[PDB]
């Protein structure tokens, strides 16, 4: 139950493929980084994707 | 609730013997405590109760034809009277 707080970016399922095209299930995880940001006007440490943090869109306090 | 507490009198050989000793047997509501029974007897029959002895009887298997079932669970109370008497009949 881990997702980006701001965007809801989350892990997705797909395949890991060999050269022989053998298929095994794998996951792609979001680059979630625990950061202190204001939630409900109060600082809170939350998991946020690096993409969301990029361009200083999310303020860290 | 006194009328609700005491369902009926018990008439049997053992019960009759107890009646000679001023002990009266009544089938009672399955959920009632002995204190409730004592107060109920005192209100209904206007007698003084020395003591109440109580016991539970399990449901008993009974068969009619091909149909198998149980009798009702019973709570039986024996009431010793310090004063007065109860005329069951």
């Amino acid at each position: 139950g881990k997702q980006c707080f701001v965007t809801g970016r989350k892990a997705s399922t797909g395949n890991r493929r060999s050269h022989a095209l053998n298929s095994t299930k794998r996951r792609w995880n979001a680059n979630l980084q625990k950061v202190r940001i204001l939630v409900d006007g109060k600082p809170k440490k939350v998991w946020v994707s690096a993409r969301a943090l990029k361009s200083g869109k999310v303020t860290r306090v | 609730e006194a009328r609700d507490i005491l369902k009926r009198p018990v008439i049997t050989e053992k019960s009759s013997e107890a009646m000679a000793e001023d002990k009266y047997t009544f089938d009672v509501d399955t959920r009632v405590n002995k204190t409730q029974v004592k107060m109920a007897v005192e209100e209904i029959f206007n007698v003084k109760v020395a003591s109440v002895n109580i016991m539970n009887y399990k449901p008993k298997k009974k068969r009619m034809g091909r149909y198998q079932g149980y009798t009702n669970k019973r709570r039986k109370a024996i009431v010793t009277l310090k004063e007065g008497s109860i005329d069951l009949f």
Partner: protein
């Protein structure tokens, strides 16, 4: 006692009748237990009257509310 007669009775009168009816029923049950009751139909007659008495009482309380 039919509901019409019960309706004529005051709330207190119904309450008194409920007490009186319950005592009568209790007596009948003890009589049946001792094998002294032949008129067994009386038991049911008393029961239905008590049910009627309670119904009229409830109807009044709902009307008040």
């Amino acid at each position: 006692m039919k509901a019409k007669e019960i309706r004529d009775l005051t709330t207190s009168e119904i309450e008194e009748q409920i007490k009186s009816s319950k005592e009568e029923l209790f007596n009948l049950r003890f009589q049946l237990a001792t094998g002294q009751l032949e008129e067994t139909a009386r038991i049911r007659t008393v029961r239905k009257t008590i049910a009627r008495l309670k119904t009229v009482a409830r109807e009044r309380e709902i009307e008040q509310s």
